[PDB]
Amino acid sequence: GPHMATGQDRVVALVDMDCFFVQVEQRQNPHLRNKPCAVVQYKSWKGGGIIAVSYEARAFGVTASMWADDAKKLCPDLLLAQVRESRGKANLTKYREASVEVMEIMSRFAVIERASIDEAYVDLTSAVQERLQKLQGQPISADLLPSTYIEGLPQGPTVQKEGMRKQGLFQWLDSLQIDNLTSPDLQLTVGAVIVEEMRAAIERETGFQCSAGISHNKVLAKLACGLNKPNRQTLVSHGSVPQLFSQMPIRKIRSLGGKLGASVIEILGIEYMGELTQFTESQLQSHFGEKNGSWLYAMCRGIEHDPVKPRQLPKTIGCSKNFPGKTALATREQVQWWLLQLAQELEERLTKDRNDNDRVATQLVVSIRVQGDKRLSSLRRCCALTRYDAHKMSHDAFTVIKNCNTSGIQTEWSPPLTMLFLCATKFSAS
DNA sequence: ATTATGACGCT
DNA sequence: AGCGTCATA
Ligand SMILES: [Ca+2]
Ligand SMILES: [Mg+2]
Ligand SMILES: [Mg+2]
Secondary structure (H helix, E strand, O other), X not given: OOOOOOOOOOOEEEEEEOOHHHHHHHHHOHHHOOOOEEEEEXXXXXXXXXXXXOXXXXXXXXXXXXXXXXXXXXXXXXXXXXXXXXXXXXXXHHHHHHHHHHHHHHOOOOOEEEEEOOEEEEEOHHHHHHHHHHHOOOOXXXXXXXXXXXXXXXXXXXOOHHHHHHHHHHHHHHHOOOOOOOOHHHHHHHHHHHHHHHHHHHXXXXXXXXXXXXXXXXXXXXHHHHHOOOOOEEEOXXXXXXXXXXXXXXXXXXXXXXXXXXHHHHHHOOOXXXXXXXXXXXXXXXXXXXXXXXXXXXXXOOOOOOOOXXXXXXXXXXXXXXXXXXXXXXXXXXXXXXXXXXXXXXXXXXXXHHHHHOEXXXXXEEEEEEOOOOOOOOEEEEEEOOOOOHHHHHHHHHHHHXXXXXXXXXXXXXXXXXXXXXXXXXXXXX
């Protein structure tokens, strides 16, 4: 009873940009705004591969991981923006730079953890305490939460979407006890007020819209964010978890979308997150290991302790290119030319990074894939990165992989290379 | 022939 | 260290 932790100690948000690369291209080119449109990389092979899709285009069934030629079958009027190509490869700089715009705005409100190119976690616990004291026990107006959904509401004793949202928000606010500054539900609500402000700032200052989730930890905040996309935010309270989880497929929770999640389902013979509550912590630890078992035991009750790391910048800077099918690199000079191309982009990004961020990478990781290997990486070797020079880095890369060449002829490369990867790691302050 | 990334876990 | 897992545009 009184000693059972409820995982309600923090307020955590997850902010995720809507259709992000598409919004970046729509800002740049007003002709793409309010249209079915997608972002594609390359073109020759089946029209190029789609990697982002506007909500208008999703209505036609267009998805990412779709070839443009196939997308055009579903949506003949689909508009397409191409990823830039430099040095023979896709270059994602425009989107990385747009990401920095958003991340810097978020950082004004709180410490953030960059979780991907288009999303960050926010620990709002301290900010909420401060807003609560300014507030002085004053009720929170629905007007302060104009894009917020309360998951699970309305409920109990109109047929339009915005009407339903307000109904649920009214029920939530009607029940709140604004008298208690330590009330977790109140804390989440104030968190949601701050995230409205954050999201308004992002849209004002960049033109980009986003969604967000507000909860007590990262996993629930992430889950919440997706419940009402696009351009909306969702509050998932501790109390909402039993109903939410009672029909939530296990694979929907972050980290369970792969083999572990499949094993939870198979071994325990369950389907939904809530079904996990019936197992003891030791039972879960016995199947999934000590760490996973404890994590699952807490997570299925809405509890998770993973901190929001104070890290706004990526820890690694990498450059990679596939050489599929027939385009696989079969000559040494091919290999050396592409290592140089990758190394030149890497040097460019590294030099910019050193100037912007006062740090230097000290380790170069070189990775290749070989034709036939199911595995995405076949081989990964590290060497010292002592100087930001593309020719040195590419020469060094060649040295660490040169022995991979099975071919008795040194001019020939066998088996042909289907991937090259250069990655700068182990930063030190500079 | 999705591709180009990027974080964290295991041993 | 090198490999694997999981994730996101
Ligand atoms: Ca997104
Ligand atoms: Mg995202
Ligand atoms: Mg996505």
